[PDB]
Amino acid sequence: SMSMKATRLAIPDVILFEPRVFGDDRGFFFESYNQRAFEEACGHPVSFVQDNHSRSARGVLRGLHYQIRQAQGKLVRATLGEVFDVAVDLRRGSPTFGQWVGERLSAENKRQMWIPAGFAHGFVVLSEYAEFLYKTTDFWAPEHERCIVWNDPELKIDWPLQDAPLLSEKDRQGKAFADADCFP
């Protein structure tokens, strides 16, 4: 009896989870998600309808993404390698509007971040490759997808990069925070 750990971040609706891992002669086992435990920690019901999996090379940066309608809460983790994962509060009425939190998530540390609807999300790959898995509370709606550019000068996100990031065209063309659609 050790157990799952949940820790609210500086933007308290963002939660850092750490599973309890059971090792034995075969390798290991852990629960990567448990609805009862998760809901207890969050303080409200959450339902996931899609799971996504990406593989990215060192220096790849994906984000900052959100859906302005059909907004998605995201529970994210790394199953290979290491990333720095960032959540940006885009709720206009929030006292932390325009602030961000970031944590290193890796296959080894098994940490996860819960990033509710109303946030933008992104990550950068620190390892040779990283595989990133996340669960979403609503479906992909490309018509509603929005992007804020990684290096926005108002957000001032400290990405641990040693070189220019490798971006998709969509992400390279992200809007400035000042011009971005935000949530109430």
Ligand X SMILES: Cc1cn([C@H]2C[C@H](O)[C@@H](COP(=O)(O)OP(=O)(O)O[C@H]3O[C@@H](C)C(=O)[C@@H](O)[C@H]3O)O2)c(=O)[nH]c1=O
Question: What does the binding site for its own copies look like in residue numbers (CB under 8 A)?
Answer: 24-36, 48-57, 60, 62, 79-80, 129, 131, 133, 135, 139-140, 166, 168
- The neighbour count for residue 68, using CB atoms within 10 Å, is 15
Annotated active-site residue in 44, 66, 134, 144: 134
Q: If contact means CB under 5 to 8 A according to the sort of partner, which of its own copies, ligand X, none does residue 55 touch?
A: its own copies
In the block, which residue shows the tokens 């885009």? 90
- Least CB distance from residue 3 to ligand X, whole Å? 10
| Residue 66 to residue 59: CA distance in whole angstroms | 21
175 marked among binding-site residues = no
Q: If contact means CB under 5 to 8 A according to the sort of partner, which of ligand X, its own copies, none does residue 172 touch?
A: none
26 marked among binding-site residues = yes
Q: How many CA within 13 A on the CB side of residue 36?
A: 1
CB 62 within 8 A of CB 136: no
35 in contact with ligand X (CB under 6 A): no
Give, as one character, the DSSP assignment of residue 142.
G
- Least CB distance from residue 124 to its own copies, whole Å? 11
Encoded amino acid at 57, one letter: A
69 marked among binding-site residues = no
| Residue 74 to residue 167: CA distance in whole angstroms | 21
Annotated active-site residue in 33, 44, 53, 65: 65
39 in contact with ligand X (CB under 6 A): no
CB 9 within 8 A of CB 36: no
Q: Which of 13, 14, 19, 62 binds ligand X (CB under 6 A)?
A: 62
| Residues involved in catalysis | 65, 134
